[PDB]
Ligand binder design. Structure first.
Ligand SMILES: [Cu+2]
Ligand SMILES: [Cu+2]
Ligand SMILES: [Zn+2]
Ligand SMILES: [Zn+2]
Lengths: 151, 151
């Protein structure tokens, strides 16, 4: 696939539409998320595209290379670690990310996996505690969706 | 990869969970759908995993070999043509299918595409009008979900 899309939904008011486009050896991630509290919110690809138990069944961050959690510019990061999105005072986050590790084809393909936006900021593995190294202390999963193939 | 799952939802009461498992060289489809009217209901893989406009944005039947619509046992069918599921008087349809054209990897992969359950029976391409050769006259899309990777 060259293009993909994800619609984020949850039990609360958070919702959004994320688009993905392969460009060169990168994936361009664009879209918007609404209903968030102003400030930063962790934003990652989780391993499974299983929404049988809401966002909980999506599993942990996508990590085929068995690394610790980090920020997007770090060498030591999960393939799914896309850092944070930032909501404004009206609860709207505009997504504009370029990433070279996620892919829409091959081994690191995220098609069929789940995008999740979280309750708190991702501390990018620099939190000083053990949870920082696993999840970034991003807390709750507010909304998620399975990444599908788009036209 | 080897296992996939889809949660079907829509604007009505129809809901369901469908599991896919690669066994040997084929794909086994199992699960259940509830909230349906008694009788047969078309059940197909549609091309796009795009639920931005509900089930409408899933597009037509997945059809990489550019054939006309048919039943699952026909030579002339779309890869997405899985026939009908049958609901009992209580509105429950048990799904138990084995198909030789869909896959979970490669060119025929359905990961990231959309499973749809329709309002009316699929006539398996034998209705005699142009619409039969496209959709089986299965009608509206009652529920759908994007097919994701499962553990
Ligand atoms: Cu996450
Ligand atoms: Cu259909
Ligand atoms: Zn991570
Ligand atoms: Zn068809």
């Amino acid at each position: 696939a060259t293009k993909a899309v994800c619609v984020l939904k949850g039990d609360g008011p958070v919702q959004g539409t994320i688009h993905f486009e392969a460009k060169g050896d990168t994936v361009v991630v664009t879209g918007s998320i609404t209903g968030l509290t102003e400030g930063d919110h962790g934003f990652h690809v989780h391993q499974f595209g299983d929404n049988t138990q809401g966002c909980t069944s999506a599993g942990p961050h996508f990590n085929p290379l068995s690394k610790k959690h980090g920020g997007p510019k770090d060498e030591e990061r999960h393939v799914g670690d896309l850092g944070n999105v930032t909501a404004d005072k009206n609860g709207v986050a505009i997504v504009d990310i370029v990433d070279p590790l996620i892919s829409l084809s091959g081994e690191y393909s995220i098609i069929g996996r789940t995008m999740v936006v979280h309750e708190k900021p991702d501390d990018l593995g620099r939190g000083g505690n053990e949870e920082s190294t696993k999840t970034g202390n991003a807390g709750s999963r507010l909304a998620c969706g399975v990444i599908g193939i788009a036209k």
